[PDB]
């Protein structure tokens, strides 16, 4: 099982009819998982997720690094992010967002659980946030979400 040869272009991702799930939300910084409608070509086992990161707090956030871990029977891959910083929210302009394509291979069709480590900085001040998400679409519906 691998995901090495899989790269799903952001622009190519169609929306599913599912609601985004909250992976992390603290101090105006929320990360949601947007489940793609389709699977990569030839990969019915891969759930394509558009991870969004939004900053609604008055302070800017930089050095944003998201990492994930999946059950041994699965494989998780994170494509490069659209960026690593989020400007402070400003009523005058649309919120600053970062998107990161995450791929999850679940060949055996088991229940999905995803751990993550969020790392970022406010100025030089470091932050490390860890968590577990277990709100995913039924594996049976992957590919036609």
């Amino acid at each position: 099982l691998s995901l090495a040869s899989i790269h799903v272009p952001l622009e190519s991702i169609k929306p599913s009819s599912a609601l985004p799930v909250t992976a992390y939300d603290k101090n105006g910084f929320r990360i949601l998982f947007h489940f793609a409608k389709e699977c990569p070509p030839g990969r019915p086992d891969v759930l394509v997720v558009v991870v969004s990161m939004l900053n609604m707090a008055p302070l800017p956030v930089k050095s944003i690094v998201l990492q994930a871990a999946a059950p041994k029977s699965m494989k998780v891959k994170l494509q490069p992010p659209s960026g690593t910083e989020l400007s402070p929210f400003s009523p005058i302009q649309p919120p600053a967002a970062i998107t990161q394509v995450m791929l999850l291979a679940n060949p055996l069709k088991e229940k999905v659980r995803l751990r993550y480590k969020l790392t970022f900085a406010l100025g030089e001040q470091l932050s490390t946030e860890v968590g577990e998400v277990d709100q995913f679409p039924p594996v049976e519906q992957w590919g036609n979400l």
Partner: peptide, 8 residues
Amino acid sequence: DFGPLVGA
């Protein structure tokens, strides 16, 4: 039983 942390 999880795998290791993975990053871009």
